[PDB]
Amino acid sequence: SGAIYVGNYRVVNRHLATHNDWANLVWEDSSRDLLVSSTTAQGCDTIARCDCQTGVYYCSSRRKHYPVSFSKPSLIFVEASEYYPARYQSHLMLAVGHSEPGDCGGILRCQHGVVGIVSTGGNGLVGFADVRDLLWLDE
Ligand SMILES: COc1ncccc1CC(=O)N1CCC[C@H](C(N)=O)C1
Ligand SMILES: [Zn+2]
Numbered sequence: 001s002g003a004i005y006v007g008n009y010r011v012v013n014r015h016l017a018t019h020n021d022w023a024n025l026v027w028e029d030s031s032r033d034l035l036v037s038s039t040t041a042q043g044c045d046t047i048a049r050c051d052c053q054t055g056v057y058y059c060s061s062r063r064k065h066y067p068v069s070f071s072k073p074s075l076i077f078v079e080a081s082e083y084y085p086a087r088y089q090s091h092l093m094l095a096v097g098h099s100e101p102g103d104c105g106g107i108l109r110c111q112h113g114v115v116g117i118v119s120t121g122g123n124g125l126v127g128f129a130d131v132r133d134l135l136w137l138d139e
Pocket of ligand 2: 048
Protein backbone atom coordinates (compact mmCIF):
# COMPACT_ATOMS: atom_id res chain seq x y z
CA SER A 1 0.00 0.00 0.00
CA GLY A 2 0.91 3.69 -0.33
CA ALA A 3 -0.24 6.96 -1.93
CA ILE A 4 0.96 10.45 -3.09
CA TYR A 5 -0.91 13.46 -1.71
CA VAL A 6 -0.52 16.56 -3.88
CA GLY A 7 -2.87 19.46 -3.28
CA ASN A 8 -6.48 18.26 -3.31
CA TYR A 9 -5.51 14.94 -4.99
CA ARG A 10 -4.63 11.46 -3.79
CA VAL A 11 -2.72 9.19 -6.25
CA VAL A 12 -2.89 5.40 -5.73
CA ASN A 13 -2.44 2.11 -7.65
CA ARG A 14 -5.73 1.56 -9.52
CA HIS A 15 -5.78 -2.13 -8.43
CA LEU A 16 -5.70 -1.02 -4.72
CA ALA A 17 -8.22 1.88 -4.87
CA THR A 18 -10.92 1.90 -2.16
CA HIS A 19 -14.72 2.56 -2.52
CA ASN A 20 -13.99 6.15 -1.36
CA ASP A 21 -11.43 6.59 -4.18
CA TRP A 22 -14.07 5.47 -6.73
CA ALA A 23 -16.80 7.67 -5.16
CA ASN A 24 -14.44 10.70 -5.49
CA LEU A 25 -12.90 9.74 -8.87
CA VAL A 26 -11.11 12.46 -10.86
CA TRP A 27 -9.15 10.23 -13.31
CA GLU A 28 -8.19 6.58 -13.80
CA ASP A 29 -6.15 4.64 -16.39
CA SER A 30 -6.29 0.83 -16.20
CA SER A 31 -3.41 0.69 -18.74
CA ARG A 32 -1.16 2.68 -16.31
CA ASP A 33 -2.46 1.08 -13.03
CA LEU A 34 -3.20 4.62 -11.75
CA LEU A 35 -6.23 6.20 -10.08
CA VAL A 36 -6.59 9.75 -8.73
CA SER A 37 -9.30 10.80 -6.27
CA SER A 38 -10.15 14.08 -4.49
CA THR A 39 -9.36 14.91 -0.83
CA THR A 40 -10.78 17.67 1.41
CA ALA A 41 -7.30 18.73 2.74
CA GLN A 42 -4.21 20.19 0.96
CA GLY A 43 -1.34 17.67 0.65
CA CYS A 44 2.18 19.00 0.11
CA ASP A 45 4.01 16.23 -1.82
CA THR A 46 6.19 17.70 -4.56
CA ILE A 47 5.95 16.02 -7.99
CA ALA A 48 9.24 15.91 -9.92
CA ARG A 49 9.19 17.50 -13.38
CA CYS A 50 12.33 15.97 -14.97
CA ASP A 51 13.92 13.20 -17.18
CA CYS A 52 15.81 11.58 -14.21
CA GLN A 53 16.90 7.97 -14.36
CA THR A 54 18.24 7.57 -10.78
CA GLY A 55 16.40 7.82 -7.48
CA VAL A 56 15.38 6.07 -4.25
CA TYR A 57 12.29 3.90 -3.58
CA TYR A 58 10.58 2.64 -0.41
CA CYS A 59 10.29 -1.17 -0.06
CA SER A 60 7.85 -2.13 2.73
CA SER A 61 8.81 -5.87 2.46
CA ARG A 62 12.30 -4.91 3.77
CA ARG A 63 11.50 -1.68 5.79
CA LYS A 64 14.32 -0.02 3.76
CA HIS A 65 14.86 2.60 1.04
CA TYR A 66 16.89 1.52 -2.00
CA PRO A 67 18.82 3.65 -4.51
CA VAL A 68 18.05 2.63 -8.15
CA SER A 69 18.81 3.28 -11.82
CA PHE A 70 15.55 3.02 -13.73
CA SER A 71 14.47 2.94 -17.38
CA LYS A 72 12.54 5.65 -19.25
CA PRO A 73 8.67 5.41 -19.21
CA SER A 74 7.46 2.76 -21.65
CA LEU A 75 4.99 -0.02 -22.68
CA ILE A 76 6.08 -3.21 -20.92
CA PHE A 77 4.29 -6.61 -20.94
CA VAL A 78 2.83 -7.57 -17.52
CA GLU A 79 1.62 -11.11 -16.69
CA ALA A 80 -1.95 -11.85 -15.52
CA SER A 81 -3.18 -11.34 -11.92
CA GLU A 82 -6.53 -11.30 -10.02
CA TYR A 83 -6.70 -7.55 -10.91
CA TYR A 84 -5.73 -7.57 -14.61
CA PRO A 85 -5.50 -9.94 -17.58
CA ALA A 86 -2.00 -10.22 -19.24
CA ARG A 87 -1.47 -6.87 -21.06
CA TYR A 88 0.97 -4.02 -21.91
CA GLN A 89 1.15 -1.48 -19.11
CA SER A 90 2.16 1.99 -20.37
CA HIS A 91 4.25 4.71 -18.57
CA LEU A 92 6.20 1.98 -16.68
CA MET A 93 9.84 2.22 -15.50
CA LEU A 94 11.92 -0.84 -14.48
CA ALA A 95 14.90 -1.04 -12.09
CA VAL A 96 17.00 -3.91 -10.65
CA GLY A 97 15.64 -4.39 -7.14
CA HIS A 98 13.48 -6.27 -4.69
CA SER A 99 9.69 -6.13 -4.47
CA GLU A 100 6.65 -8.27 -3.39
CA PRO A 101 2.92 -7.62 -4.29
CA GLY A 102 2.31 -5.66 -1.03
CA ASP A 103 5.10 -3.25 -2.01
CA CYS A 104 2.76 -1.51 -4.59
CA GLY A 105 2.33 2.10 -3.42
CA GLY A 106 5.94 2.66 -2.32
CA ILE A 107 7.16 6.05 -3.54
CA LEU A 108 10.09 6.46 -5.97
CA ARG A 109 11.82 9.85 -5.38
CA CYS A 110 14.66 11.66 -7.09
CA GLN A 111 16.37 14.99 -6.09
CA HIS A 112 13.33 16.86 -7.60
CA GLY A 113 10.50 15.13 -5.72
CA VAL A 114 8.04 12.29 -6.37
CA VAL A 115 8.68 10.33 -9.60
CA GLY A 116 6.03 7.60 -9.22
CA ILE A 117 4.86 4.56 -7.22
CA VAL A 118 5.74 0.81 -7.23
CA SER A 119 3.30 -0.98 -9.54
CA THR A 120 4.93 -4.25 -10.80
CA GLY A 121 7.76 -6.68 -9.86
CA GLY A 122 9.28 -10.09 -10.44
CA ASN A 123 12.60 -11.78 -11.28
CA GLY A 124 14.68 -9.16 -9.44
CA LEU A 125 13.04 -6.28 -11.37
CA VAL A 126 10.76 -3.61 -9.86
CA GLY A 127 8.36 -1.52 -12.00
CA PHE A 128 7.23 2.04 -11.14
CA ALA A 129 4.16 3.85 -12.53
CA ASP A 130 5.50 7.26 -13.62
CA VAL A 131 3.54 10.40 -12.52
CA ARG A 132 5.87 13.23 -13.85
CA ASP A 133 3.82 13.80 -17.05
CA LEU A 134 0.55 14.45 -15.11
CA LEU A 135 1.08 18.24 -15.03
CA TRP A 136 -2.54 18.88 -13.87
CA LEU A 137 -1.70 17.49 -10.40
CA ASP A 138 -0.20 20.96 -9.55
CA GLU A 139 -2.72 23.16 -11.43
C1 LIG B 1 5.44 -5.13 -6.77
O1 LIG B 1 4.67 -6.16 -7.38
C2 LIG B 1 5.20 -7.40 -7.44
N1 LIG B 1 6.46 -7.62 -7.11
C3 LIG B 1 6.89 -8.89 -7.10
C4 LIG B 1 6.10 -9.96 -7.42
C5 LIG B 1 4.79 -9.72 -7.79
C6 LIG B 1 4.29 -8.42 -7.81
C7 LIG B 1 2.83 -8.17 -8.15
C8 LIG B 1 2.66 -7.57 -9.53
O2 LIG B 1 3.62 -7.33 -10.26
N2 LIG B 1 1.39 -7.31 -9.92
C9 LIG B 1 0.18 -7.63 -9.15
C10 LIG B 1 -0.62 -6.36 -8.86
C11 LIG B 1 -0.89 -5.56 -10.14
C12 LIG B 1 0.40 -5.32 -10.95
C13 LIG B 1 0.10 -4.55 -12.23
N3 LIG B 1 0.43 -3.27 -12.23
O3 LIG B 1 -0.41 -5.12 -13.20
C14 LIG B 1 1.12 -6.65 -11.20
ZN1 LIG C 1 14.07 16.01 -12.10
